[PDB]
Amino acid sequence: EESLDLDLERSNRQVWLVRLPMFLAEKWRDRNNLHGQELGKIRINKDGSKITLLLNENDNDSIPHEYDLELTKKVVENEYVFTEQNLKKTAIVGTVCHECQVMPS
Amino acid sequence: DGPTMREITETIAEAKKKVLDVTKEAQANLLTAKHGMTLRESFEDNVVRFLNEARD
Amino acid sequence: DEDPNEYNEFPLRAIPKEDLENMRTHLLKFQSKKKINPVTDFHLPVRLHRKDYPWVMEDFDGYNTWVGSYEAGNSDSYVLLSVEDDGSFTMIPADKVYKFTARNKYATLTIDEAEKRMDKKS
Amino acid sequence: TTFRFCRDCNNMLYPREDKENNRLLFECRTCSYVEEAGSPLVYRHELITNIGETAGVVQDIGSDPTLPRSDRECPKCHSRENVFFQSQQRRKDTSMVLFFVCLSCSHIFTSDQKNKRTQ
Ligand SMILES: [Zn+2]
Numbered sequence A: 001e002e003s004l005d006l007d008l009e010r011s012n013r014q015v016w017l018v019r020l021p022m023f024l025a026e027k028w029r030d031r032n033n034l035h036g037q038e039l040g041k042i043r044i045n046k047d048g049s050k051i052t053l054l055l056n057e058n059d060n061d062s063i064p065h066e067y068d069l070e071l072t073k074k075v076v077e078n079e080y081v082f083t084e085q086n087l088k089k090t091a092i093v094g095t096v097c098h099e100c101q102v103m104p105s
Numbered sequence B: 001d002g003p004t005m006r007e008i009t010e011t012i013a014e015a016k017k018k019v020l021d022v023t024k025e026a027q028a029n030l031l032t033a034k035h036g037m038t039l040r041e042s043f044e045d046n047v048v049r050f051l052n053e054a055r056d
Numbered sequence C: 001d002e003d004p005n006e007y008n009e010f011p012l013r014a015i016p017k018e019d020l021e022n023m024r025t026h027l028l029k030f031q032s033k034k035k036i037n038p039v040t041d042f043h044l045p046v047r048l049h050r051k052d053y054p055w056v057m058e059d060f061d062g063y064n065t066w067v068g069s070y071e072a073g074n075s076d077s078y079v080l081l082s083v084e085d086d087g088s089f090t091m092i093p094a095d096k097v098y099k100f101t102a103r104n105k106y107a108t109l110t111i112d113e114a115e116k117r118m119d120k121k122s
Numbered sequence D: 001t002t003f004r005f006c007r008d009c010n011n012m013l014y015p016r017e018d019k020e021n022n023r024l025l026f027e028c029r030t031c032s033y034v035e036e037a038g039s040p041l042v043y044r045h046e047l048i049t050n051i052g053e054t055a056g057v058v059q060d061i062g063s064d065p066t067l068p069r070s071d072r073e074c075p076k077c078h079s080r081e082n083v084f085f086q087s088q089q090r091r092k093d094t095s096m097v098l099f100f101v102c103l104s105c106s107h108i109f110t111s112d113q114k115n116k117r118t119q
């Protein structure tokens, strides 16, 4: 579009940044795109905020183990995500509202 | 001699305490350095001097 | 144990393989000290250009410029999680993380002259 | 001392006197920032230091086997369980005063029978 321009963060879209263990990501790659690559689900538990990640049964044969997430602060920093398409257009997609680390299990 | 060895052991024994006594005195900050010497330098001098007085 | 409680769990679409910018989702990070505010009438415009490659970010002239440099990697990696209107989450791997990386400015008509004065010092 | 930085630059602050209202400020030499001073003290030398004596007193201090123990009753919790060391300020002059760290209340007491401390 306008060349060399950046796109639209003004919309204030929020996204989460999550640190994942290398092994888990490796597993995720396995999921088929055709499937839509549903890796598993995220659980939000109350009685305090607890968030965990569990792999889909298809991913591994065993009992799915929950991976606890440690919520973290934004830190004194502003993190924004920008994307570059094949077209090489650049867009300012969203701001990182929350940070989290998925612990290995 | 058997008793000379008892007498020697008890010479070192008393010097060993005399040293602990100056150490306890130095740890309690009551030690008063000799003009032109560290509080520590002054202490080590005493320790070294007692221990030699003893060996002799 | 038994779950007397309720959990809200969302399906996670492990990263869709085919995305237009599947290839590039990047992180642009600014230090809080820089005090960059995206909601600025001034910062309405913004251009991002590769410097020939650090990225160069610039607003309209008269505004600060930032340089973006790439951070080192690790065993763990970051994914961007976005949520669809339907609760489902889609995750995308971060291609690269850049620390920006801007100007000041007040660096014109100086630098080279100051060093020279400093030399007039020794 | 304890000095501040410029919000906006993060660059350090240089003192400027406001000749008119007879007051001290802190200017930034990279931008147009100025802020009034908290204290009148700008520079402190300190030749006869005491900062270094009780350094590296991590709560894990008890986990050092190299450290010696004593049956001295604590001024706070009265516990006869404590590790001890000498002034960690690695100077020649330095006194052989001992610092005892409680294996319960974590309070630092000394053997100094000349003076009374709080560090
Ligand atoms: Zn400044």
Ligand SMILES: [Zn+2]
Binding pocket: D074, D075, D076, D077, D078, D079, D102, D103, D104, D105, D106, D107
């Ligand atoms: Zn105590």
